[PDB]
Design a protein around this ligand. Structure first.
Ligand code: ADP
Lengths: 481, 62
Protein backbone atom coordinates (compact mmCIF):
# COMPACT_ATOMS: atom_id res chain seq x y z
CA UNK A 1 0.00 0.00 0.00
CA UNK A 2 2.68 2.62 0.84
CA UNK A 3 4.76 1.62 -2.20
CA UNK A 4 1.82 2.11 -4.58
CA UNK A 5 1.34 5.72 -3.41
CA UNK A 6 4.59 6.84 -5.05
CA UNK A 7 3.31 5.70 -8.45
CA UNK A 8 0.14 7.80 -8.28
CA UNK A 9 2.07 10.88 -7.15
CA UNK A 10 4.67 10.54 -9.91
CA UNK A 11 1.89 10.11 -12.48
CA UNK A 12 -0.21 13.02 -11.20
CA UNK A 13 2.51 15.66 -11.65
CA UNK A 14 3.52 14.18 -15.02
CA UNK A 15 0.26 15.30 -16.63
CA UNK A 16 0.51 18.74 -15.00
CA UNK A 17 3.88 19.46 -16.66
CA UNK A 18 2.36 19.14 -20.16
CA UNK A 19 2.82 22.59 -21.69
CA UNK A 20 5.12 24.06 -19.01
CA UNK A 21 8.83 23.75 -19.76
CA UNK A 22 11.59 24.44 -17.22
CA UNK A 23 8.91 24.47 -14.50
CA UNK A 24 9.27 20.97 -13.04
CA UNK A 25 10.50 22.22 -9.66
CA UNK A 26 7.60 24.70 -9.49
CA UNK A 27 4.78 22.20 -10.10
CA UNK A 28 6.01 19.45 -7.76
CA UNK A 29 6.61 22.00 -5.00
CA UNK A 30 3.07 23.40 -5.20
CA UNK A 31 1.57 19.90 -5.28
CA UNK A 32 3.24 18.93 -2.00
CA UNK A 33 1.99 22.06 -0.23
CA UNK A 34 -1.54 21.51 -1.58
CA UNK A 35 -1.72 18.05 0.04
CA UNK A 36 -0.20 19.18 3.36
CA UNK A 37 -1.75 22.57 4.14
CA UNK A 38 1.25 24.82 3.45
CA UNK A 39 1.95 27.85 1.25
CA UNK A 40 4.31 28.76 -1.58
CA UNK A 41 5.80 32.12 -2.54
CA UNK A 42 6.77 33.06 -6.10
CA UNK A 43 9.16 35.86 -7.08
CA UNK A 44 10.11 37.06 -10.54
CA UNK A 45 9.21 39.32 -13.45
CA UNK A 46 5.56 39.28 -14.59
CA UNK A 47 5.25 36.85 -17.49
CA UNK A 48 6.73 33.49 -16.50
CA UNK A 49 3.55 31.40 -16.08
CA UNK A 50 3.18 32.52 -12.46
CA UNK A 51 -0.64 32.45 -12.68
CA UNK A 52 -1.01 29.19 -14.64
CA UNK A 53 0.49 27.12 -11.81
CA UNK A 54 -2.22 28.46 -9.50
CA UNK A 55 -5.00 27.46 -11.92
CA UNK A 56 -3.48 24.03 -12.67
CA UNK A 57 -3.42 22.80 -9.06
CA UNK A 58 -7.23 22.91 -8.91
CA UNK A 59 -7.43 20.00 -11.37
CA UNK A 60 -5.76 17.57 -8.95
CA UNK A 61 -8.76 17.69 -6.59
CA UNK A 62 -12.30 16.59 -7.38
CA UNK A 63 -13.96 19.64 -5.77
CA UNK A 64 -11.60 22.62 -6.00
CA UNK A 65 -12.49 26.26 -6.71
CA UNK A 66 -9.84 28.65 -8.01
CA UNK A 67 -9.61 32.36 -7.25
CA UNK A 68 -7.41 34.76 -9.25
CA UNK A 69 -7.16 38.31 -7.90
CA UNK A 70 -4.66 41.15 -8.24
CA UNK A 71 -4.07 43.15 -5.06
CA UNK A 72 -4.04 46.90 -5.69
CA UNK A 73 -3.10 49.89 -3.56
CA UNK A 74 -6.78 50.85 -3.20
CA UNK A 75 -8.14 47.32 -2.72
CA UNK A 76 -11.02 46.81 -0.30
CA UNK A 77 -11.87 43.66 1.69
CA UNK A 78 -15.37 43.70 0.18
CA UNK A 79 -13.95 42.67 -3.22
CA UNK A 80 -11.66 39.86 -1.99
CA UNK A 81 -13.53 38.20 0.89
CA UNK A 82 -16.92 38.96 -0.66
CA UNK A 83 -19.18 41.94 0.02
CA UNK A 84 -21.60 42.09 2.92
CA UNK A 85 -25.36 42.62 2.83
CA UNK A 86 -24.40 38.27 6.36
CA UNK A 87 -21.50 38.41 3.88
CA UNK A 88 -22.07 37.32 0.27
CA UNK A 89 -19.00 35.08 -0.02
CA UNK A 90 -20.22 32.92 -2.92
CA UNK A 91 -16.99 31.95 -4.66
CA UNK A 92 -14.30 34.14 -3.11
CA UNK A 93 -11.83 33.15 -0.37
CA UNK A 94 -13.55 31.56 2.68
CA UNK A 95 -14.93 28.80 0.41
CA UNK A 96 -12.03 28.33 -2.02
CA UNK A 97 -9.54 25.47 -2.19
CA UNK A 98 -6.81 27.36 -4.09
CA UNK A 99 -6.45 31.15 -3.93
CA UNK A 100 -4.02 33.31 -5.91
CA UNK A 101 -3.05 36.84 -4.86
CA UNK A 102 -0.71 38.68 -7.24
CA UNK A 103 1.47 41.51 -5.90
CA UNK A 104 0.86 41.12 -2.17
CA UNK A 105 3.40 43.79 -1.14
CA UNK A 106 0.91 46.60 -1.77
CA UNK A 107 -2.36 45.77 0.04
CA UNK A 108 -4.07 47.71 2.81
CA UNK A 109 -3.95 47.12 6.56
CA UNK A 110 -7.45 45.61 6.68
CA UNK A 111 -6.72 42.91 4.09
CA UNK A 112 -3.32 42.02 5.57
CA UNK A 113 -4.71 41.64 9.10
CA UNK A 114 -7.53 39.34 7.98
CA UNK A 115 -5.14 37.20 5.90
CA UNK A 116 -3.09 36.23 8.97
CA UNK A 117 -6.04 34.58 10.74
CA UNK A 118 -6.89 32.46 7.69
CA UNK A 119 -3.50 30.68 7.84
CA UNK A 120 -2.97 29.99 11.55
CA UNK A 121 -6.59 29.63 12.67
CA UNK A 122 -7.99 28.82 9.19
CA UNK A 123 -11.12 30.85 10.01
CA UNK A 124 -12.74 34.14 9.04
CA UNK A 125 -14.70 36.78 10.96
CA UNK A 126 -18.03 36.53 9.12
CA UNK A 127 -19.75 39.32 11.01
CA UNK A 128 -20.80 37.43 14.14
CA UNK A 129 -20.05 33.70 13.99
CA UNK A 130 -16.83 32.32 12.51
CA UNK A 131 -16.49 29.54 9.94
CA UNK A 132 -13.62 27.34 8.81
CA UNK A 133 -11.85 27.85 5.49
CA UNK A 134 -10.87 24.74 3.44
CA UNK A 135 -7.83 26.49 1.96
CA UNK A 136 -5.65 23.62 0.71
CA UNK A 137 -3.03 25.75 -1.08
CA UNK A 138 -2.08 29.43 -0.81
CA UNK A 139 0.15 30.88 -3.54
CA UNK A 140 1.27 34.51 -3.69
CA UNK A 141 3.38 36.04 -6.45
CA UNK A 142 4.79 39.52 -7.03
CA UNK A 143 7.89 41.12 -8.56
CA UNK A 144 9.81 43.10 -5.91
CA UNK A 145 10.69 42.58 -2.25
CA UNK A 146 8.91 44.27 0.68
CA UNK A 147 10.55 46.75 3.01
CA UNK A 148 12.74 45.60 5.89
CA UNK A 149 10.77 47.73 8.41
CA UNK A 150 7.12 47.45 7.41
CA UNK A 151 3.95 45.51 8.20
CA UNK A 152 4.36 43.28 5.12
CA UNK A 153 7.12 41.25 6.81
CA UNK A 154 4.55 39.30 8.84
CA UNK A 155 3.13 37.54 5.77
CA UNK A 156 6.58 36.84 4.30
CA UNK A 157 7.78 35.15 7.49
CA UNK A 158 4.76 32.81 7.46
CA UNK A 159 5.24 31.64 3.86
CA UNK A 160 7.23 28.40 3.86
CA UNK A 161 8.18 27.76 0.23
CA UNK A 162 9.84 30.74 -1.47
CA UNK A 163 10.62 30.15 -5.15
CA UNK A 164 12.43 32.60 -7.45
CA UNK A 165 11.01 31.84 -10.89
CA UNK A 166 12.62 33.36 -13.97
CA UNK A 167 12.58 33.06 -17.76
CA UNK A 168 13.80 30.05 -19.72
CA UNK A 169 17.52 29.66 -20.44
CA UNK A 170 17.90 26.45 -22.46
CA UNK A 171 17.72 26.78 -26.24
CA UNK A 172 16.21 23.32 -26.77
CA UNK A 173 13.49 23.94 -24.17
CA UNK A 174 12.60 27.31 -25.74
CA UNK A 175 11.67 25.95 -29.17
CA UNK A 176 9.06 23.51 -27.84
CA UNK A 177 7.73 26.14 -25.42
CA UNK A 178 7.40 28.87 -28.05
CA UNK A 179 5.39 26.49 -30.28
CA UNK A 180 2.98 24.74 -27.90
CA UNK A 181 -0.45 23.50 -28.97
CA UNK A 182 -1.58 22.25 -25.55
CA UNK A 183 -4.49 24.26 -24.14
CA UNK A 184 -3.59 25.87 -20.82
CA UNK A 185 -7.26 26.19 -19.77
CA UNK A 186 -8.26 22.57 -20.44
CA UNK A 187 -8.19 19.52 -18.12
CA UNK A 188 -5.10 17.39 -18.86
CA UNK A 189 -5.38 15.29 -15.67
CA UNK A 190 -7.28 11.97 -15.90
CA UNK A 191 -10.13 11.19 -13.54
CA UNK A 192 -8.29 8.16 -12.11
CA UNK A 193 -5.41 10.32 -10.83
CA UNK A 194 -7.61 12.98 -9.20
CA UNK A 195 -7.73 12.76 -5.41
CA UNK A 196 -10.99 12.93 -3.47
CA UNK A 197 -12.00 14.90 -0.39
CA UNK A 198 -11.74 11.82 1.84
CA UNK A 199 -8.13 11.12 0.83
CA UNK A 200 -7.07 14.69 1.64
CA UNK A 201 -8.41 14.58 5.20
CA UNK A 202 -6.84 11.16 5.82
CA UNK A 203 -3.38 12.19 4.60
CA UNK A 204 -3.27 15.14 7.01
CA UNK A 205 -3.23 12.75 9.98
CA UNK A 206 -0.55 10.44 8.56
CA UNK A 207 1.82 13.34 7.83
CA UNK A 208 2.50 14.16 11.48
CA UNK A 209 2.97 10.46 12.33
CA UNK A 210 6.25 10.22 10.39
CA UNK A 211 9.09 9.19 12.69
CA UNK A 212 12.18 11.39 12.99
CA UNK A 213 15.43 9.37 12.88
CA UNK A 214 18.41 10.37 14.97
CA UNK A 215 20.58 10.79 11.87
CA UNK A 216 18.28 13.48 10.45
CA UNK A 217 18.23 15.50 13.68
CA UNK A 218 22.03 15.74 13.65
CA UNK A 219 21.89 17.44 10.23
CA UNK A 220 19.12 19.93 11.04
CA UNK A 221 20.82 21.13 14.23
CA UNK A 222 24.16 21.42 12.42
CA UNK A 223 22.73 23.58 9.63
CA UNK A 224 20.92 25.80 12.15
CA UNK A 225 24.07 26.41 14.21
CA UNK A 226 26.12 27.17 11.09
CA UNK A 227 23.83 30.07 10.14
CA UNK A 228 23.97 31.60 13.64
CA UNK A 229 27.74 32.15 13.37
CA UNK A 230 27.86 33.79 9.93
CA UNK A 231 26.94 37.50 10.01
CA UNK A 232 25.72 37.46 6.39
CA UNK A 233 23.52 34.40 6.98
CA UNK A 234 19.73 34.92 7.08
CA UNK A 235 18.00 34.52 10.43
CA UNK A 236 15.80 31.41 10.65
CA UNK A 237 13.13 31.59 13.35
CA UNK A 238 11.52 28.67 15.16
CA UNK A 239 8.38 28.96 13.03
CA UNK A 240 10.38 28.38 9.84
CA UNK A 241 12.04 25.27 11.30
CA UNK A 242 8.80 23.75 12.61
CA UNK A 243 6.84 24.32 9.39
CA UNK A 244 9.68 22.88 7.28
CA UNK A 245 9.18 19.47 8.92
CA UNK A 246 5.57 19.26 7.71
CA UNK A 247 6.78 19.62 4.11
CA UNK A 248 9.71 17.24 4.70
CA UNK A 249 7.63 14.52 6.36
CA UNK A 250 5.07 14.63 3.54
CA UNK A 251 7.86 14.37 0.95
CA UNK A 252 8.74 10.85 2.13
CA UNK A 253 5.11 9.82 2.71
CA UNK A 254 4.19 10.35 -0.96
CA UNK A 255 7.41 8.65 -2.12
CA UNK A 256 6.93 5.28 -0.43
CA UNK A 257 8.79 5.86 2.85
CA UNK A 258 7.79 5.80 6.51
CA UNK A 259 10.60 7.89 8.05
CA UNK A 260 12.35 11.15 7.21
CA UNK A 261 15.07 10.59 4.61
CA UNK A 262 18.32 12.61 4.49
CA UNK A 263 17.63 13.42 0.82
CA UNK A 264 14.72 15.66 1.87
CA UNK A 265 17.15 18.36 3.08
CA UNK A 266 17.42 19.80 -0.45
CA UNK A 267 13.92 21.30 -0.11
CA UNK A 268 15.28 23.83 2.42
CA UNK A 269 17.01 25.81 -0.35
CA UNK A 270 13.70 27.53 -1.22
CA UNK A 271 12.54 28.32 2.33
CA UNK A 272 15.46 29.69 4.33
CA UNK A 273 16.33 32.43 1.84
CA UNK A 274 14.45 35.74 1.72
CA UNK A 275 16.29 38.16 -0.62
CA UNK A 276 19.02 38.22 -3.26
CA UNK A 277 21.81 38.13 -0.67
CA UNK A 278 20.45 35.02 1.07
CA UNK A 279 19.95 33.07 -2.17
CA UNK A 280 23.67 32.54 -2.83
CA UNK A 281 24.38 31.71 0.83
CA UNK A 282 21.56 29.23 1.51
CA UNK A 283 22.18 27.22 -1.66
CA UNK A 284 25.91 27.11 -0.82
CA UNK A 285 25.63 26.05 2.84
CA UNK A 286 23.15 23.27 2.04
CA UNK A 287 25.25 21.96 -0.85
CA UNK A 288 28.20 21.52 1.53
CA UNK A 289 26.14 19.55 4.06
CA UNK A 290 24.42 17.54 1.32
CA UNK A 291 27.83 16.56 -0.11
CA UNK A 292 29.68 16.23 3.20
CA UNK A 293 27.67 15.15 6.25
CA UNK A 294 24.52 13.85 4.53
CA UNK A 295 25.81 10.43 3.43
CA UNK A 296 28.95 10.48 5.63
CA UNK A 297 31.00 11.96 2.79
CA UNK A 298 33.18 14.22 4.95
CA UNK A 299 32.98 11.82 7.89
CA UNK A 300 34.70 9.09 5.88
CA UNK A 301 37.32 11.45 4.43
CA UNK A 302 38.79 12.28 7.84
CA UNK A 303 38.65 8.59 8.78
CA UNK A 304 40.43 7.49 5.59
CA UNK A 305 43.32 9.87 6.29
CA UNK A 306 43.97 8.13 9.61
CA UNK A 307 44.41 4.80 7.80
CA UNK A 308 46.84 6.34 5.31
CA UNK A 309 48.78 7.97 8.15
CA UNK A 310 48.85 4.65 10.02
CA UNK A 311 50.04 2.80 6.91
CA UNK A 312 52.87 5.28 6.39
CA UNK A 313 53.83 4.99 10.06
CA UNK A 314 54.14 1.20 9.89
CA UNK A 315 56.11 1.45 6.63
CA UNK A 316 58.67 3.93 7.99
CA UNK A 317 59.15 1.84 11.14
CA UNK A 318 60.10 -1.34 9.24
CA UNK A 319 62.37 0.50 6.79
CA UNK A 320 65.48 -1.19 8.26
CA UNK A 321 64.83 -4.37 6.24
CA UNK A 322 64.89 -2.85 2.74
CA UNK A 323 67.64 -0.33 1.99
CA UNK A 324 68.40 1.63 -1.20
CA UNK A 325 71.35 0.47 -3.32
CA UNK A 326 72.44 2.64 -6.26
CA UNK A 327 74.21 0.84 -9.10
CA UNK A 328 77.13 2.43 -10.94
CA UNK A 329 77.89 2.78 -14.65
CA UNK A 330 81.08 2.91 -16.67
CA UNK A 331 81.61 5.04 -19.76
CA UNK A 332 83.82 8.08 -20.26
CA UNK A 333 82.65 11.08 -18.24
CA UNK A 334 84.26 13.78 -16.11
CA UNK A 335 81.72 13.38 -13.29
CA UNK A 336 80.71 10.28 -11.34
CA UNK A 337 77.43 9.36 -13.03
CA UNK A 338 75.03 7.10 -11.14
CA UNK A 339 72.14 4.95 -12.37
CA UNK A 340 68.90 3.99 -10.66
CA UNK A 341 67.32 0.55 -10.42
CA UNK A 342 65.92 -0.80 -13.72
CA UNK A 343 62.72 -2.86 -13.50
CA UNK A 344 62.69 -2.60 -9.69
CA UNK A 345 61.21 0.91 -9.96
CA UNK A 346 59.11 2.20 -12.86
CA UNK A 347 56.74 4.80 -11.39
CA UNK A 348 57.23 8.48 -12.21
CA UNK A 349 56.01 10.06 -8.95
CA UNK A 350 57.32 7.34 -6.66
CA UNK A 351 57.70 7.81 -2.91
CA UNK A 352 60.82 7.18 -0.82
CA UNK A 353 60.70 6.72 2.94
CA UNK A 354 63.38 7.57 5.50
CA UNK A 355 64.62 6.19 8.81
CA UNK A 356 65.32 8.91 11.38
CA UNK A 357 62.86 11.79 10.80
CA UNK A 358 64.23 15.31 10.44
CA UNK A 359 62.86 18.86 10.57
CA UNK A 360 62.68 20.31 7.04
CA UNK A 361 61.25 23.80 6.45
CA UNK A 362 60.24 24.07 10.13
CA UNK A 363 58.06 20.96 9.86
CA UNK A 364 58.27 17.19 10.16
CA UNK A 365 58.10 14.69 7.29
CA UNK A 366 57.79 10.91 6.97
CA UNK A 367 58.08 10.33 3.20
CA UNK A 368 59.55 12.29 0.29
CA UNK A 369 58.03 11.70 -3.15
CA UNK A 370 60.56 12.28 -5.94
CA UNK A 371 60.18 12.49 -9.71
CA UNK A 372 61.68 9.91 -12.06
CA UNK A 373 62.26 12.53 -14.77
CA UNK A 374 64.40 14.70 -12.47
CA UNK A 375 66.19 11.90 -10.60
CA UNK A 376 68.01 10.71 -13.73
CA UNK A 377 69.47 14.17 -14.42
CA UNK A 378 70.74 14.70 -10.86
CA UNK A 379 72.38 11.27 -10.60
CA UNK A 380 74.25 11.82 -13.90
CA UNK A 381 74.79 15.53 -14.62
CA UNK A 382 74.48 16.77 -11.04
CA UNK A 383 73.45 20.15 -9.68
CA UNK A 384 70.46 20.65 -7.38
CA UNK A 385 67.23 18.67 -7.05
CA UNK A 386 63.75 19.49 -5.78
CA UNK A 387 61.10 17.53 -3.92
CA UNK A 388 57.85 18.03 -2.03
CA UNK A 389 57.33 17.04 1.60
CA UNK A 390 54.69 14.47 2.64
CA UNK A 391 53.49 14.32 -0.96
CA UNK A 392 52.01 17.83 -0.70
CA UNK A 393 53.12 21.39 -1.33
CA UNK A 394 55.65 22.67 -3.82
CA UNK A 395 58.87 20.92 -4.84
CA UNK A 396 61.29 22.42 -2.32
CA UNK A 397 65.06 22.12 -2.53
CA UNK A 398 66.72 19.49 -0.33
CA UNK A 399 70.30 18.65 0.61
CA UNK A 400 70.48 15.38 -1.29
CA UNK A 401 73.89 13.76 -1.76
CA UNK A 402 75.52 10.39 -2.37
CA UNK A 403 77.06 8.17 0.31
CA UNK A 404 80.04 5.84 0.48
CA UNK A 405 77.76 2.76 0.47
CA UNK A 406 75.72 3.88 -2.57
CA UNK A 407 72.88 5.47 -0.62
CA UNK A 408 70.99 8.77 -0.53
CA UNK A 409 71.61 11.09 2.44
CA UNK A 410 69.21 13.96 3.16
CA UNK A 411 70.59 16.72 5.39
CA UNK A 412 68.79 19.60 7.08
CA UNK A 413 69.94 22.71 8.97
CA UNK A 414 71.93 20.79 11.62
CA UNK A 415 73.86 18.51 9.21
CA UNK A 416 71.92 15.39 10.20
CA UNK A 417 72.29 12.32 8.01
CA UNK A 418 69.34 10.18 6.99
CA UNK A 419 69.45 7.21 4.62
CA UNK A 420 66.49 6.95 2.26
CA UNK A 421 64.62 3.73 1.49
CA UNK A 422 61.87 2.57 -0.85
CA UNK A 423 58.63 0.91 0.31
CA UNK A 424 58.52 -2.85 -0.11
CA UNK A 425 55.85 -4.97 -1.74
CA UNK A 426 49.59 -4.69 3.00
CA UNK A 427 49.66 -5.30 6.76
CA UNK A 428 46.86 -7.06 8.58
CA UNK A 429 45.94 -4.02 10.67
CA UNK A 430 45.66 -1.71 7.65
CA UNK A 431 43.56 -4.23 5.70
CA UNK A 432 41.20 -4.67 8.67
CA UNK A 433 40.52 -0.94 9.04
CA UNK A 434 40.17 -0.49 5.26
CA UNK A 435 37.62 -3.31 5.01
CA UNK A 436 35.44 -1.76 7.72
CA UNK A 437 35.48 1.65 6.02
CA UNK A 438 34.70 0.13 2.62
CA UNK A 439 31.64 -1.64 4.05
CA UNK A 440 30.31 1.66 5.43
CA UNK A 441 30.67 3.30 2.01
CA UNK A 442 28.65 0.52 0.37
CA UNK A 443 25.92 0.77 3.02
CA UNK A 444 25.73 4.56 2.63
CA UNK A 445 25.59 4.29 -1.17
CA UNK A 446 22.78 1.73 -0.92
CA UNK A 447 20.61 4.18 1.02
CA UNK A 448 21.01 6.85 -1.66
CA UNK A 449 20.07 4.39 -4.42
CA UNK A 450 16.78 3.63 -2.60
CA UNK A 451 15.55 7.20 -2.09
CA UNK A 452 16.86 9.28 -5.02
CA UNK A 453 13.66 8.60 -7.02
CA UNK A 454 11.72 11.23 -5.06
CA UNK A 455 9.46 13.52 -7.09
CA UNK A 456 10.20 16.62 -4.97
CA UNK A 457 13.94 16.55 -5.75
CA UNK A 458 15.56 18.61 -8.55
CA UNK A 459 17.28 16.75 -11.35
CA UNK A 460 20.48 18.81 -11.43
CA UNK A 461 21.13 18.07 -7.74
CA UNK A 462 21.51 14.33 -8.43
CA UNK A 463 24.76 14.87 -10.35
CA UNK A 464 26.51 16.40 -7.34
CA UNK A 465 25.48 13.73 -4.82
CA UNK A 466 26.66 10.90 -7.09
CA UNK A 467 29.95 12.68 -7.82
CA UNK A 468 30.61 13.24 -4.11
CA UNK A 469 29.99 9.60 -3.19
CA UNK A 470 32.16 8.28 -6.03
CA UNK A 471 35.11 10.45 -4.98
CA UNK A 472 35.24 8.80 -1.55
CA UNK A 473 35.06 5.30 -3.02
CA UNK A 474 37.80 6.09 -5.53
CA UNK A 475 40.21 7.29 -2.83
CA UNK A 476 39.78 4.23 -0.59
CA UNK A 477 40.43 1.89 -3.54
CA UNK A 478 43.84 3.46 -4.24
CA UNK A 479 45.23 2.76 -0.76
CA UNK A 480 44.59 -0.99 -1.16
CA UNK A 481 46.90 -1.35 -4.16
CA UNK B 1 -12.49 40.75 -13.89
CA UNK B 2 -10.96 41.88 -17.20
CA UNK B 3 -7.93 39.61 -16.75
CA UNK B 4 -10.07 36.46 -16.66
CA UNK B 5 -11.84 37.34 -19.93
CA UNK B 6 -8.54 37.14 -21.86
CA UNK B 7 -6.82 34.11 -20.31
CA UNK B 8 -9.76 31.94 -19.23
CA UNK B 9 -12.09 33.52 -21.84
CA UNK B 10 -14.95 33.18 -19.35
CA UNK B 11 -16.89 35.28 -16.85
CA UNK B 12 -18.06 34.63 -13.28
CA UNK B 13 -21.84 34.70 -13.80
CA UNK B 14 -22.74 34.25 -10.15
CA UNK B 15 -22.58 30.46 -9.86
CA UNK B 16 -21.75 28.76 -13.16
CA UNK B 17 -19.34 30.17 -15.74
CA UNK B 18 -19.88 30.66 -19.47
CA UNK B 19 -17.49 31.12 -22.36
CA UNK B 20 -17.01 34.51 -24.04
CA UNK B 21 -16.69 34.55 -27.87
CA UNK B 22 -14.46 37.63 -27.83
CA UNK B 23 -12.72 37.90 -31.21
CA UNK B 24 -11.02 41.31 -30.89
CA UNK B 25 -10.23 43.56 -27.92
CA UNK B 26 -9.37 47.20 -28.66
CA UNK B 27 -8.41 49.68 -25.94
CA UNK B 28 -7.55 53.32 -26.59
CA UNK B 29 -6.48 56.13 -24.26
CA UNK B 30 -4.22 59.19 -24.27
CA UNK B 31 -1.57 58.76 -21.56
CA UNK B 32 0.66 55.96 -20.28
CA UNK B 33 0.15 54.11 -16.97
CA UNK B 34 2.57 54.30 -14.07
CA UNK B 35 5.68 52.13 -13.93
CA UNK B 36 4.74 50.78 -10.45
CA UNK B 37 0.96 50.33 -10.41
CA UNK B 38 -1.74 47.71 -10.89
CA UNK B 39 -2.48 48.88 -14.45
CA UNK B 40 0.71 47.23 -15.75
CA UNK B 41 -0.94 43.80 -15.71
CA UNK B 42 -3.32 44.64 -18.57
CA UNK B 43 -0.64 46.46 -20.57
CA UNK B 44 1.72 43.47 -20.47
CA UNK B 45 -1.02 41.18 -21.84
CA UNK B 46 -1.92 43.40 -24.82
CA UNK B 47 0.04 42.10 -27.81
CA UNK B 48 -0.14 44.81 -30.48
CA UNK B 49 0.69 48.34 -29.27
CA UNK B 50 0.08 51.09 -31.84
CA UNK B 51 0.88 54.80 -31.46
CA UNK B 52 -1.66 56.72 -33.55
CA UNK B 53 -1.52 60.45 -34.22
CA UNK B 54 -3.07 63.13 -36.43
CA UNK B 55 -2.64 63.50 -40.19
CA UNK B 56 0.61 65.01 -41.46
CA UNK B 57 0.17 65.14 -45.25
CA UNK B 58 -1.45 68.20 -46.80
CA UNK B 59 -3.28 66.20 -49.48
CA UNK B 60 -4.65 63.74 -46.91
CA UNK B 61 -6.10 66.46 -44.67
CA UNK B 62 -8.16 68.11 -47.42
N1 ADP C 1 8.15 29.49 -18.71
C1 ADP C 1 7.03 29.16 -19.40
N2 ADP C 1 6.86 27.93 -19.93
C2 ADP C 1 5.75 27.60 -20.61
N3 ADP C 1 4.72 28.44 -20.82
C3 ADP C 1 4.75 29.70 -20.34
C4 ADP C 1 5.93 30.15 -19.59
N4 ADP C 1 5.71 31.42 -19.23
C5 ADP C 1 4.49 31.77 -19.72
N5 ADP C 1 3.92 30.75 -20.38
C6 ADP C 1 2.59 30.77 -21.04
O1 ADP C 1 2.13 32.12 -21.18
C7 ADP C 1 0.73 32.20 -20.89
C8 ADP C 1 0.42 33.47 -20.12
O2 ADP C 1 1.19 33.50 -18.92
P1 ADP C 1 0.93 34.63 -17.80
O3 ADP C 1 -0.30 34.24 -17.01
O4 ADP C 1 0.99 35.98 -18.48
O5 ADP C 1 2.21 34.48 -16.84
P2 ADP C 1 2.38 35.41 -15.54
O6 ADP C 1 1.23 35.01 -14.65
O7 ADP C 1 3.75 35.04 -15.01
O8 ADP C 1 2.29 36.82 -16.07
C9 ADP C 1 0.37 30.95 -20.09
O9 ADP C 1 -0.78 30.32 -20.67
C10 ADP C 1 1.57 30.04 -20.18
O10 ADP C 1 1.20 28.80 -20.80
Amino acid sequence: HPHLLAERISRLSSSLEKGLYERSHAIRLCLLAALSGESVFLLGPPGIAKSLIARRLKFAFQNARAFEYLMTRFSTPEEVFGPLSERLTSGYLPEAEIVFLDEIWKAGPAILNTLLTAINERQFRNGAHVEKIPMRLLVAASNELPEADSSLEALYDRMLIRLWLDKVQDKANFRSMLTSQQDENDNPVPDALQVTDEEYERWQKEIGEITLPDHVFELIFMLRQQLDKLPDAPYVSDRRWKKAIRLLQASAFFSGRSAVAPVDLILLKDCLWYDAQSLNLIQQQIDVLMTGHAWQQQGMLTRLGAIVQRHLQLQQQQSDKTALTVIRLGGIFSRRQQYQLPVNVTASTLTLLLQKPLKLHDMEVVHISFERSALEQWLSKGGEIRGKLNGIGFAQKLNLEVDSAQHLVVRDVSLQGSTLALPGSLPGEIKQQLEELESDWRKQHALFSEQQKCLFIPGDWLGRIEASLQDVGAQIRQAQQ
